[PDB]
Design a protein around this nucleic acid. Structure first.
Ligand SMILES: [K+]
Ligand SMILES: [Mg+2]
Ligand SMILES: [Mg+2]
Ligand SMILES: [Mg+2]
Ligand SMILES: [Mg+2]
Ligand SMILES: [Mg+2]
Ligand SMILES: [Mg+2]
Ligand SMILES: [Mg+2]
Ligand SMILES: [Mg+2]
Lengths: 126, 137, 86, 164, 206
RNA sequence: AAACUCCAGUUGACACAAAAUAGACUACGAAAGUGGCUUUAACAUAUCUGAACACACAAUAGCUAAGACCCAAACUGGGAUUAGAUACCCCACUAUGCUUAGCCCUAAACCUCAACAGUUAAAUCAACAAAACUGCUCGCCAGAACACUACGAGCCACAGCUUAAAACUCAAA
């Protein structure tokens, strides 16, 4: 079909989010996407679909090192299209919107607050 | 001597021994990692069931069966029940691509058994039965 | 079933490094195409869809290889300017 | 008879608290002219007792009420349209009786008076059912009402009640 | 502001200029040459190259100020320091030989330790999102907690239940109480550190 | 949640079902189609064109008898779901998908390119599609809708398939 020309040129939403979360975790469990990505052991927190099904935001847990975070970010944006193709080819969803990898840092507040409460002084009846 | 990734063969003699036994005499831990459940059965080389543990047998219920923690607990239970029968070294035979594929092996190792080889036996038909239709979610 | 066991898809653990053995087995199954076959065999792919997918994958590979060849060929020119000013 | 205006689509969206035209999940006949055509095809309703189902905004309700019915019984499953139907009732005193509940489960054999019960062998017993319901619930209702006709009970305790 | 942006803050440190050129690092050397070209603002009344300068006590005096009356504020501060010193001497003279090694008589050490003992490490932020105020914990910055300690001390000493007890006498007593981890200021810190734990689950929201 | 608990795991025996990888190959056949292994037959024409109807074939679906039945699955039941729920998710199981002998004769049956022979010089050429043409032959088309329609005729079809108009109407399509 002239491929050279082509290349040259809500309750339902919650179920879809859960299904896509499981599918993306399953995809990341193996080197199916790439060996480099498999090495980094990316872990996902949640998957959120926009109300118009225009984009899929996958929230991946960040680490403490910054260079590792940057490398993970780069490989994830380079591999998102391959994940979309794999998801659509496996017939997990007949049409998947573009996948966007967003960093998750919500646990940082809890971690810092735990660290400070460990060393804080509550006095009598702690 | 260079380490061989390939398993030993029963015919050709080899110097690899584990606690004095040969490769084909080590017990086998069969892991079935389904999508909602994981089942571990330890058997002897002569196919004597020694221990059995699945995520449903360790109290996990419904969707909690198909998680890594549940498979780890099942692996630990099977490892304990097999350690009580004289098993130390095991050959792991995994079947399926469920969430508990690797958590069961974590549990088995954390229960004290030593894994000497990993084998995959996931059923791959050469186009036999027809699969079901894709879900229209 | 009728074959000898512990020969196919079997990996030996070195120095108790179970993680490396498992990851090597995953690499083997992925590069032999077994993982993709398992994932694709969960639901039935209609013959026309399979044909279209295979054609798209083949032509995508061809186009990507051609574009990469073009970029590598034209990368030789990318260097410091020898006639700067003019 | 002075009736309140027919709700527009925007008022319906706001009443359902949807804030969009894409999560409606329903189709409304908001043309009083087609509804008048339907009630015309329902026969001559002068001094008749109508049991309407699935009014929603109430175009069919208005069309029937303009015809000189003796009393109109409405069964609505949404509380969100009951205010509009109450305004319609205030507009027409005594000709509209609104009931909240399912049409699959409502018991009509007690709704109207016992003086309308005409023998089966005679003409249709001056009672009529008119309905513009969702297509996902109109088929169980017709099956149920066919069973009732076979047993001559339910809405057909009055006789050979006509349905539209 | 009557100072142009090119003007920079002065550095009143006296030993900083005395650092030998041998010790200077290349970045330090670079900044030392760079400062030559810059314009420097006139040093404000207050901080001096003196050896008895205490920025913390100066800030406390500034916070005790009412109506620009710095003379009275500094008078109160020096009276507080003298009262603390006299109370410690009076307690040290009446102490046994083995207790004399564990009585502090320097008022500056007592003041700094009293303010440190009252610094809260965690605080609360009012945040109305769901139509209702939700007080969530937050890690306080160091400057924030240092300010909060001073403000709690001053507000505690401005309470009206203390009638005719002059501010120097109230403030010396409160400083000596906080030196031993006692008094209402330490209880105010404790009631905040407990109310920030009783609303720990609210960190999930934020 | 229903369902099963004559259930599930290892091991052994075991299809009238469909044929991983090779295949990133682009082959065979008039088309439709054809991708597990072996063997037997076997892939017309020493000019070209030549049919809605003549003579032989035509994916999938569908219909007669007999048979097989793992899995899948129109329908049919049950489970869960808002406030007119999920038609869409889950479980069970039919016609059917398979074999033998007959029918039915339709597809976006498309490379949306009629068959053979020739040319690349021209002005290349409405646009897009797929560079522009020539010679010769058959088939077909002459505004839209009425109309993949009515009637007539034919057919293993009985509503089906092929062929296929007219009246009124419009200035457009
Ligand atoms: K085509
Ligand atoms: Mg010919
Ligand atoms: Mg002809
Ligand atoms: Mg056919
Ligand atoms: Mg058939
Ligand atoms: Mg069947
Ligand atoms: Mg079929
Ligand atoms: Mg021809
Ligand atoms: Mg016809």
């Amino acid at each position: 079909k002239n491929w050279l020309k082509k290349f040259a040129s809500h309750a339902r939403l919650r179920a879809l989010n859960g299904l896509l979360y499981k599918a993306l975790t399953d995809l990341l469990c193996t080197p199916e996407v790439s060996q480099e990505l498999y090495d980094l052991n990316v872990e996902l927190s949640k998957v959120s679909l926009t109300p118009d099904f225009s984009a899929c935001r996958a929230y991946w847990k960040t680490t403490l090192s910054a260079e590792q975070n940057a490398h993970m970010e780069a490989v994830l944006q380079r591999s998102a299209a391959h994940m979309r193709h794999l998801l659509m080819s496996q017939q997990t969803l007949r049409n998947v919107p573009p996948i966007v990898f967003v960093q998750d840092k919500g646990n940082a507040a809890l971690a810092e607050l735990d660290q400070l409460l460990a060393v804080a002084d509550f006095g009598p009846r702690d | 001597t260079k380490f061989s990734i390939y398993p030993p063969i029963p015919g050709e003699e080899s110097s690899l021994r584990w606690a004095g036994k040969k490769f084909e005499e080590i017990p086998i831990a069969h892991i079935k990692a389904s999508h909602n459940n994981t089942q571990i059965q330890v058997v002897s080389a002569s196919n004597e069931p020694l221990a059995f543990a699945s995520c449903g047998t360790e109290g996990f219920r419904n969707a909690k069966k198909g998680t890594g923690i549940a498979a780890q607990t099942a692996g630990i239970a099977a490892a304990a029940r097999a350690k009580q029968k004289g098993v130390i070294h095991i050959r792991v035979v995994v079947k399926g691509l469920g969430p508990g594929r690797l958590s069961a092996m974590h549990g088995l190792i954390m229960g004290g058994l030593e894994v000497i080889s990993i084998t995959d036996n996931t059923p791959i038909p050469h186009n036999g039965c027809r699969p079901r239709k894709a879900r229209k979610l | 079933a009728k074959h000898l066991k512990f020969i196919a898809r079997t990996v030996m653990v070195q120095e108790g490094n179970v993680e490396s053995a498992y990851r090597t087995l995953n690499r083997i199954l992925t590069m032999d195409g077994l993982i993709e076959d398992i994932k694709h065999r969960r639901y039935y792919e209609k013959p026309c869809r399979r044909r279209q997918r295979e054609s798209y994958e083949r032509c995508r590979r061809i186009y990507n290889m051609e574009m990469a060849r073009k970029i590598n060929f034209l990368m030789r020119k990318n260097r410091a300017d020898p006639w700067q000013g003019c | 008879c002075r009736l309140p205006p027919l709700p527009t689509i925007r008022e319906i969206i706001k009443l359902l608290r949807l804030q969009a035209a894409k999560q409606l999940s329903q189709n409304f006949l908001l043309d009083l002219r087609l509804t008048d055509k339907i009630v015309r095809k329902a026969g001559n309703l002068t001094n008749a007792y109508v049991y309407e189902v699935g009014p929603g905004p109430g175009g069919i309700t208005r069309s029937i009420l303009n015809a000189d019915v003796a009393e109109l019984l409405v069964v609505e499953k949404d509380t969100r349209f009951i205010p509009g139907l109450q305004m319609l009732s205030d507009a027409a005193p005594g000709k509209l009786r609104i009931v909240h509940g399912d049409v699959l489960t409502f018991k009509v054999e007690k709704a109207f008076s016992e003086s309308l019960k005409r023998p089966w062998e005679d003409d249709p017993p001056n009672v009529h059912i008119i309905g513009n319901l969702p297509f996902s619930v109109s088929t169980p209702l017709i099956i149920k009402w066919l069973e009732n006709i076979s047993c001559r009970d339910g809405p057909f305790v009055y006789g050979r009640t006509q349905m539209t | 502001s009557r100072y142009s942006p090119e003007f920079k803050d002065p550095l009143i440190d006296k030993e900083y200029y005395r650092k030998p050129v041998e010790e200077l690092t290349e970045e330090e050397k670079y900044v030392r040459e760079l400062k030559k070209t810059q314009l420097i603002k006139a040093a404000p009344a207050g901080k001096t190259s003196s050896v008895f300068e205490d920025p913390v006590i100066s800030k406390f005096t500034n916070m005790m100020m009412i109506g620009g009356n710095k003379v009275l504020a500094r008078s109160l501060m020096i009276q507080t320091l003298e009262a603390v010193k006299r109370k410690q001497f009076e307690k040290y003279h009446a102490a046994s030989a083995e207790e004399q090694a564990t009585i502090e008589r320097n008022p500056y050490t007592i003041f700094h330790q009293a303010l440190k003992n009252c610094e809260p490490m965690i605080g609360l932020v009012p945040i109305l999102k769901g139509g209702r105020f939700y007080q969530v914990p937050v890690p306080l910055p160091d400057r924030r907690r240092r300010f909060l300690a001073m403000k709690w001390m001053i507000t505690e000493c401005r309470d009206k239940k203390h009638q005719r007890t002059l501010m120097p006498e109230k403030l010396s007593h409160k400083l000596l109480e906080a030196f031993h981890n006692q008094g209402p200021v330490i209880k105010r810190k404790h009631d905040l550190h407990k109310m920030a734990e009783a609303n720990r689950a609210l960190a999930h929201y934020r």
